[PDB]
Design an enzyme around this catalytic site. Structure first.
Site, PDB file in Angstrom:
ATOM      1  N   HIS A   1       0.801  -1.215   0.000  1.00 13.53           N
ATOM      2  CA  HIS A   1       0.000   0.000   0.000  1.00 13.53           C
ATOM      3  C   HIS A   1       0.844   1.281   0.000  1.00 13.53           C
ATOM      4  CE1 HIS A   1       0.152   1.251   4.245  1.00 13.53           C
ATOM      5  NE2 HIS A   1      -0.040  -0.015   4.619  1.00 13.53           N
TER       6      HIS A   1
ATOM      7  N   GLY B   1       2.633   5.931  10.700  1.00  9.15           N
ATOM      8  CA  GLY B   1       4.042   5.797  10.349  1.00  9.15           C
ATOM      9  C   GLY B   1       4.653   4.462  10.755  1.00  9.15           C
TER      10      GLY B   1
ATOM     11  N   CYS C   1       3.527   1.355   9.913  1.00  3.39           N
ATOM     12  CA  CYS C   1       3.367   0.363   8.836  1.00  3.39           C
ATOM     13  C   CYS C   1       4.723  -0.136   8.341  1.00  3.39           C
ATOM     14  CB  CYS C   1       2.541   0.941   7.690  1.00  3.39           C
ATOM     15  SG  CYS C   1       0.786   1.217   8.085  1.00  3.39           S
TER      16      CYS C   1
END
Ligand SMILES: CNC(=O)CN1C[C@@H](C(=O)Nc2cncc3cc(F)ccc23)c2cc(Cl)ccc2C1=O
Ligand SMILES: [Cl-]
Lengths: 297, 305
Positions: free
Chosen positions: A41, A135, A137
């Site tokens: 993503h 942040g 991820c």
């Protein structure tokens, strides 16, 4: 003595954390050999979006050094960025998929910089009760066996209830989740019974025996009671796995189940076990044996 | 969202762990620059432990009596000195993995990460707090002596604790990295006991503010309290006195959530009287005191849910 929620030393993983930026999105990547693995993503039909991208669109930063992306491919929900340089800090590693109830260490990162390490368990509903902010991820889950790091989780998203969802390092999600802002909810969670039992054995080893009784139970009668308190079914495999702890303490597994039954029907009565007023399920039988023995990495 | 007991990444500390052997005793040492720091009781026998004269034991030692192992490499000891309860072994190699560091002495209520080691090999990392009675509720077995406690704020490692002993109740006692013990303890196997422990009130309040930031307000009430009336109630539950310093320290969290410190103090008073009634706060059925106001601001979001 003492019983803490203990994480694996994070050093071998810290040496692999990088920052990945694609357009406006910035998240964490795992740099192993000449490949950077990160949530797909970061580019946000993923193959349709990816085909438009070129290597120079992906900015990869390792400390204060910029890595040069020379290739890119997608494997399930993970993006694999081929880089010009092999990570000299690459440890001996494997990609493994864990089962619910199994525990692991999480190195939480922001901007390719590790900020904390915590221990947690893959819940039966496949979510993790983590501690993450925007942040985070691309933060990873791992275990260590001697000198080999087994990567088992990559963080992808937070659900409305505050719990977390992610994939194994091959991009396959844990749970019936998808990687997009849509209506998703964690299923009803259950307690990891084999882990609660292991933690009761850990309490006996630390001199906490108030909850023991002279009674025993059949496996079927225990499961009939446990199903009523949203506890996971205890299988014969769990009983065999608890064998060493049973032999060490002199308390048969079904004897410890009779204590758990009384704890479930009657509570703690103002008492604690290992400093806790709730029954702890985030320590596996192996975690208990490792922490009550002294295994190093 | 979420609130976990979080430890600092241990990598910068792992690169400093070494094994120190003196005769039959084997424990951990911290290798920084060309010095290895370790508990001075590595020179003792279990007999010596009752009334050890360390100066007398150390003068009988030579450099080659101390074996220092860093991984599979043997370090050469070229000097030795004692500073309080720490032994400082000068070695012939500077540690190339030496991070930016400081030696800091912490106060009770302060938290830190512990890298537990056996034979100079790190085995686990956990977060804990210096209790008001100066002990730490750690997880240590025989061979863990010399394991260190630290904080890594920014990219600098602040070493604050070195493990030395376990008390009869299972709690742990140790020193700062300059060899001064925390608490009225001695590195003797003499009859020593931890004082009655108390709850770190400023930390419980910070954790209640963390719960409000994560969207939980069930425990708040319409009352306020005077600082003195709060302390009169809190002492009855073995809670540490809340000082004006603690109130000032809780200022930023108060401004963020819109709940005055003495109003949060009234909720704490009520929680102590009522219990939780089958409810939890941040997944816990007890009031948590091992998160400082600084830890809460570090881990929690700047935007309240
Ligand atoms: C509980 N310990 C003992 O009965 C023997 N003992 C050995 C040593 C000591 O506490 N080491 C240990 C440290 N941490 C966890 C320990 C868990 C253990 F199960 C055993 C030993 C541990 C020690 C050092 C000093 Cl400076 C002063 C006294 C002693 C001492 O009394
Ligand atoms: Cl301090």
């Amino acid at each position: 003595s003492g019983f803490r929620k203990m994480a694996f030393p994070s050093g071998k993983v810290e040496g692999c954390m990088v920052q990945v930026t694609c357009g406006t999105t910035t998240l964490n990547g795992l740099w192993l050999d000449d490949v950077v693995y990160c949530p797909r993503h970061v580019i946000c039909n993923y193959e349709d979006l990816l085909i438009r991208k070129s290597n120079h669109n992906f900015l990869v930063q390792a400390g204060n050094v910029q890595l040069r992306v020379i290739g890119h491919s997608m494997q399930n929900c993970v993006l694999k960025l081929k880089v010009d340089t092999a990570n000299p800090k690459t440890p001996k590693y494997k990609f493994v998929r864990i089962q619910p109830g199994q525990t692991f260490s999480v190195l939480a990162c922001y901007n390719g910089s590790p900020s904390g390490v915590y221990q947690c368990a893959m819940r039966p509903n496949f979510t993790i009760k983590g501690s993450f902010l925007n942040g985070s991820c691309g933060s990873v889950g791992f275990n260590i066996d001697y000198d080999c790091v087994s990567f088992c989780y990559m963080h992808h998203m937070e659900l409305p209830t505050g719990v977390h969802a992610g994939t194994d390092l091959e991009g396959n999600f844990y749970g019936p989740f998808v990687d997009r802002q849509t209506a998703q909810a964690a299923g009803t969670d259950t307690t990891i019974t084999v882990n609660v039992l292991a933690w009761l054995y850990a309490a006996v080893i630390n001199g906490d025996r108030w909850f023991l009784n002279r009674f025993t139970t059949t496996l079927n009668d225990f499961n009939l009671v446990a199903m009523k308190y949203n506890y996971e079914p205890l299988t014969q495999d769990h009983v065999d796995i608890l064998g060493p702890l049973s032999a060490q303490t002199g308390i048969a597994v079904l004897d410890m189940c009779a204590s758990l039954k009384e704890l479930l029907q009657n509570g703690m009565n103002g008492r604690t076990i290992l400093g806790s007023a709730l029954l702890e399920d985030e320590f596996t039988p192996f975690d208990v044996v490792r922490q009550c023995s002294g295994v190093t990495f």
